[PDB]
Design a protein around this ligand. Structure first.
Ligand SMILES: *[C@@H]1O[C@H](CO)[C@@H](O[C@@H]2O[C@H](CO)[C@@H](O)[C@H](O)[C@H]2NC(C)=O)[C@H](O)[C@H]1NC(C)=O
Ligand SMILES: *[C@@H]1O[C@H](CO)[C@@H](O[C@@H]2O[C@H](CO)[C@@H](O)[C@H](O)[C@H]2NC(C)=O)[C@H](O)[C@H]1NC(C)=O
Ligand SMILES: *[C@@H]1O[C@H](CO)[C@@H](O[C@@H]2O[C@H](CO)[C@@H](O)[C@H](O)[C@H]2NC(C)=O)[C@H](O)[C@H]1NC(C)=O
Ligand code: NAG
Ligand code: NAG
Ligand code: NAG
Ligand code: NAG
Ligand code: NAG
Ligand code: NAG
Ligand code: NAG
Ligand code: NAG
Ligand code: NAG
Ligand code: NAG
Ligand code: NAG
Ligand code: NAG
Lengths: 488, 488, 488
């Protein structure tokens, strides 16, 4: 009889990389880089707030277009690229910081407080800012001006008797000319001081024309201050104050903001990118470096294939597969390793289950470590920029670039090491089965050098199956085999 | 005779992770993550300065509580969470930078210089700032005010004729009302310009009430300037100047500052965390991301076990241990690998020393690379923040988070690769000893398939020991063994 | 006959590190860290602009020394440590940002625009700034002063009708005294407002003496503004304006700036460091963390040797090399593995080519992954600093330090894993050749245990060569060998 040891193969393998080979074919591989999105942001499980035409800062200030956002909460605020401001022209020095801290807070919950604005006109309105079809203003701000050509000095307090922090939004009006200023504040100067026991902020307007926006050559500059529990807001101003009407709650949690034009859809997905939600089964992704939720790590590679089967040899360090075993068996489809025989009763093929399972268990162990194991990240740094800004922006970009290159390196090395190891451990299992068989046969068979044993005795199917199931008693046949083996 | 090859085992192993297995038992492991502190900061080898009730900035300015800190030096300044300011209310725009640069300098060494403050009153004092039981002021600052309702314009120089940089601390007084201002500086305005050939700083006070602190609604704002060798300080002011009394040395070295409430103890430890000193034998630690000195790298994992022995099989790619060798020998305690025999003279067990040592040397080589090899770091970035600040703070946190995830990844992969390798190299040594024995026996023995040889000749203890010590002469017994082996 | 299997060796090996060994000798290694520069910056392929005595900012403003730089473009601007300013004394608040954005733009292309400076004197000149031997000023700036003791308020626009962004450079003059100011601007105050639809910048001069530079106690402060397409520059000023004469193109690409004293040479090199160009064949370098172009990654190690041959054994997990094979063959120089024999016709040595090539192909595969594979980087962050700056500078340094430690770790682990693997795969190939030979010999030879087979039949050179070329027919000699092997 002949008893050959072998392993499966498939007509069409997959190419993977290893430590020693750029391109080597295995029976099967899995992709470790997510490269597509469904193109919509799924609305479960993160609570999504669609900004529509409104920036977060315009929803905060209370641009008329944004009244629908009063007191809203979010996990992710989604800012659309079409959003536009439609109220009095303003800027925020350090706009990105205010956006970041509100985004991260996750709430526009606002509480009216009553200030004693004694002796001034309130509720200044502007045609740059229409609510309905009347001249109006930021809902959350209070444009104070002279009463009876008098602007009495303001000096108001507001203790924080609460248990939590308060965020106050206020501003300073910069008139285009000295005429208004006088006209608005009955006053040449204008000075603002907003303070607490822990901070002081002082602003003076800068009179001058700026290019007209909805016909306004004036500007407002927006400022903020956080008042801690047991602290006191003190506003002392002699004009140009754009006053607050109350405070915002300032919370901490996992909330953030993302710039995206993707539609919101009715579906479930843990990981969100500006392109849309992406599955998070894989450890890496090449969709977007901007992510929110439990996401694969962003890498530069568009694909990285993890071998999930042995080297494919159609038709390793242990030398069996692609080694002394000449090729695989495409015809073996119920197992990874097995036996082919020829005896007096014919020719046959059977899978070895123990060795097959050993290989599969190891590979599934690798997959268990790599698949569905992603990290959750929420509010992060900005990673795209529309304007030149210098030093800090250089550092933000360099940080992200550095991180991406280090993760791309990790991904590349991981798959090469794993693949080399996978090819080796499957080669090993072939070798181990070979060696176990050899030892079973003792003096009754000889190794032909190609994975096949020549058995020197009558060996029927029962005999073969006794080999395959490790019950074979060499002693039964020894006399016969020695006689046949050692003749002249 | 029977000669069996085997390996030790222990009743109770340790569980480790590998590349293919989340949980596999080995004979022994070592922990690679330091997870506890002794809860005190050891005072050797770093020179520790306990701030007590004083912040570094208050020790710098000379708050009365802090006079004990004049001219002190440190490796690590320790700021306590109970520290509090007890002098005139002030702020420092960019407080964190001044703290960082003084902390990093490591010295409060101060040198009196004499300015020509011609025509003003000096040594302004305040009841907000008691030294003993008299009204006083920051020791290092000089509150200038009118002399005889006159405030002559100041215009003073101070060349740096030294070889080193000078740090000047100065300030600007912000009166609560226009009344003082007049009252203090006999003057409506107030202007400060501090300059060198390399820098210019210009400040104007902002009059206004701030909430009272030790009854003071005024504030001082603190500024600093560094004067290089061969440069000149020029102070030109018409009031509101809080003047310097001299300069501070500004050094470079390994000094830093840490926020901690841990007690200082009389002991030795290279690595300091806010929780206390930690041993630095291990390569990783999960105690605190804030560290000073030669410290293990901070990781997220609370434990990572490095295998320091073979797979434990009570009662691998090479297929011997947990393979054709059915189990380990708990009874073998003088070696990792050995021989059990049965001959005509009885039954015995001996350790193989060469193979044992081979395994142990490899594992100690791994340990030599990983244990006691930590990196020294001194002044770093801040990693904890008490207040919302926006963009730069977002980047500081994102940088640290990015770094921690990359080190946690390195640690996880390192231990999995090392452990897989350790199990494999110990399996190999078992296999190698088996193969060496087999070759010794030549035609005189047969492999039973389970690690045991059947020897087909009388083999006494001398004979066995000749095998174990590699002196066995197969030729001596060949005739006998062939006769016994190849009979009918 | 005797047929011994063996491997080459060399008298003098190289020491490398592995996972289990700090120091192990192999036949050969390659260095993976570039540690030297040619000491010149090669002028191909990057377009190099040598700043000479001029900083980029002085070439931008138009210091007389720098007129040779008008409208120049660069890939890399090289700033020399001897560069010095020689015009009116100025500063730029956020100097590092303006330098960074111009450096990164890569062009000083300037376009004259005509402003309506109605009613003022233009082309203010200064003896601090000689062009030829006449008093002069920054070429790109326009010092406006009174006409006939009148300073009419300026209010000018300049629409951006172009498709691209415009960068405007302007300034504010700070007179030393109130006398000039009046003298220059016929005016006590002075106010500047530069704005667009998207930004506003407002500056007031600060009167005061600063230390004289080329006899000037006044200073100019430089500002910039970027005007987007379809936007409008609006300058509204009542004095102290240092006006622009036009705009600069602001491009994006791969341009940068580097501080270096290295000479420019006529040669080709992809990677530039301040020390000079360096070859980029290796994956790592220890020359400089400042790089431009396709450069090896900076690591802390001065050397890391990658094994490119087997363990050197003059005169592994598979146990053959440095194992049951006692030593290598220095005399074998045409192959890595081979056969030595003794038969009736003498003693001989031949290389096995198949096994040699197998080893070499694997090692070349590793080298293909590591050599000549560097990453291109252009404008980055600054990595050296001449002055104390605090928080942001702390973060820039911490980011670079973090990155370097992570790459140094990667490099260290990569070479240790690769080397352990290289020693193992070459040990394997020795073992595989041994096993293949053994199987060829079937019952005609016995394994002596030291890599040598005793062949029990007459085996002439033809016979040997039939073994070495895998044609040997064991059946031919079996009768003879069994007779010799199994006698009494
Ligand atoms: C300064 O000049 C600007 C720009 O020429 C003037 O603003 C223009 O004024 C006209 C007439 O009212 C408006 O219809 C234009 O729309 C304005 N242009 C822009 C782009 O703002 C501005 O009024 C002048 N400033 C002063 C105070 O006289
Ligand atoms: C502006 O209002 C503040 C707050 O009401 C005044 O400060 C208080 O003044 C009283 C009377 O002297 C003190 O006893 C309180 O302790 C002060 N409160 C705080 C929190 O500062 C302040 O004096 C007013 N400012 C001016 C210039 O009139
Ligand atoms: C303030 O003092 C400075 C420094 O003493 C004066 O500047 C010096 O003036 C002299 C006389 O003209 C010059 O020759 C020196 O070179 C100046 N020194 C420096 C370092 O600037 C300055 O003029 C005084 N300021 C005013 C407005 O009186
Ligand atoms: C190939 O590998 C993937 C990933 O594990 C697996 O899900 C797929 O079914 C495999 N195909 C086989 C084993 O035929
Ligand atoms: C957004 O703005 C556009 C103007 O372009 C307006 O027509 C549209 O109604 C707005 N969307 C919503 C839902 O308000
Ligand atoms: C704005 O421009 C006009 C000049 O025509 C002038 O009346 C006013 O003073 C200007 N203001 C500033 C900012 O100088
Ligand atoms: C996702 O969005 C980014 C940024 O717009 C884009 O460049 C990238 O190609 C997109 N990826 C996919 C898979 O659509
Ligand atoms: C287990 O491993 C540790 C770490 O090397 C060692 O110090 C300890 O003594 C070991 N125990 C043994 C070998 O019994
Ligand atoms: C620190 O401050 C407390 C006031 O709470 C004081 O009682 C104590 O004496 C101070 N500690 C020292 C050592 O000065
Ligand atoms: C501070 O408040 C009082 C108003 O009662 C006033 O006399 C003084 O002008 C205020 N100063 C400021 C900062 O406007
Ligand atoms: C050390 O301190 C940090 C911060 O207070 C804390 O959260 C952590 O649990 C502490 N670790 C140990 C081992 O005490
Ligand atoms: C040693 O290794 C290097 C790097 O591959 C190679 O270029 C050199 O020629 C080698 N020397 C040999 C193989 O003798
Ligand atoms: C650079 O400056 C020096 C003054 O030290 C001058 O002598 C030299 O001519 C300058 N170099 C060039 C090429 O202009
Ligand atoms: C500069 O110094 C002189 C004092 O002698 C004075 O006339 C002028 O007011 C000073 N200016 C400032 C900045 O106070
Ligand atoms: C290159 O330059 C840096 C910074 O000057 C220096 O410290 C380093 O030693 C230099 N390296 C070489 C190879 O010259």
């Amino acid at each position: 009889a002949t008893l050959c040891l072998g392993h499966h193969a498939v007509p069409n393998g997959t190419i993977v990389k290893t430590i020693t080979n750029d391109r080597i074919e295995v029976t099967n591989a899995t992709e470790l880089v997510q490269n597509s999105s469904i193109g919509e942001i799924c609305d479960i499980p993160h609570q999504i707030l669609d900004g529509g035409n409104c920036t977060l800062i315009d929803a905060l200030l209370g641009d008329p277009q944004c009244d629908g956002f009063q007191n809203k909460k979010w996990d992710l605020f989604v800012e659309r690229s079409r959003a536009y401001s439609n109220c009095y022209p303003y800027d925020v020095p350090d706009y990105a910081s205010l956006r970041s801290l509100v985004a991260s807070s996750g709430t526009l919950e606002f509480k009216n407080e009553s200030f004693n604005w004694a002796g001034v006109t309130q509720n200044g309105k502007s045609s740059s800012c229409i609510r309905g079809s009347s001249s109006s203003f930021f809902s959350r701000l209070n444009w104070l001006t002279h009463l009876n050509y008098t602007y009495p000095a303001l000096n108001v307090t507001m203790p924080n008797k609460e248990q939590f922090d308060k965020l106050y939004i206020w501003g300073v009006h910069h008139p285009d000319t000295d005429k208004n200023q006088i006209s608005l504040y009955a006053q040449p100067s204008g000075r603002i001081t907003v303070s607490t026991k822990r901070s002081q902020q002082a602003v003076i307007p800068n009179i001058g024309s700026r290019p007209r926006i909805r016909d306004i050559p004036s500007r407002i500059s927006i400022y903020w201050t956080i008042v801690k529990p047991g602290d006191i807001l003190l506003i002392n101003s002699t004009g140009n104050l754009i006053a607050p009407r109350g405070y915002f709650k300032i919370r901490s949690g996992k909330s953030s903001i993302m710039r995206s034009d993707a539609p919101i859809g009715k579906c479930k997905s843990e990981c969100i990118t500006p392109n849309g939600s992406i599955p998070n089964d894989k450890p890496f992704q090449n969709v977007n470096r901007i992510t929110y939720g439990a996401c694969p790590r962003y890498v530069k590679q568009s694909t990285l294939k993890l071998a999930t089967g042995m080297r494919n040899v159609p038709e390793g360090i242990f030398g069996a597969i692609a080694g002394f075993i000449e090729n695989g068996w495409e015809g073996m489809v119920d197992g990874w390793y097995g036996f082919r025989h020829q005896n007096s009763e014919g020719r046959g093929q059977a899978a070895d289950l123990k060795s097959t399972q050993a290989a599969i268990d190891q590979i599934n162990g690798k997959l268990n470590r790599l698949i569905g194991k992603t990290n959750e990240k929420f509010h992060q740094i900005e990673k795209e920029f529309s304007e030149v800004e210098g030093r800090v922006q250089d550092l933000e970009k360099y940080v992200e670039d550095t991180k991406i290159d280090l993760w791309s390196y990790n991904a590349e090395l991981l798959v090469a090491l794993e693949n080399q190891h996978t090819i080796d451990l499957t080669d090993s299992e072939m070798n181990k089965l070979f060696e176990k068989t050899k030892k079973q046969l003792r003096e009754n068979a000889e190794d032909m050098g190609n994975g096949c044993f020549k058995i020197y005795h009558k060996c029927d199917n029962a005999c073969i199956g006794s080999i395959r199931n490790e019950t074979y008693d060499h002693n039964v046949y020894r006399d016969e085999a020695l006689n046949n083996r050692f003749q002249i």
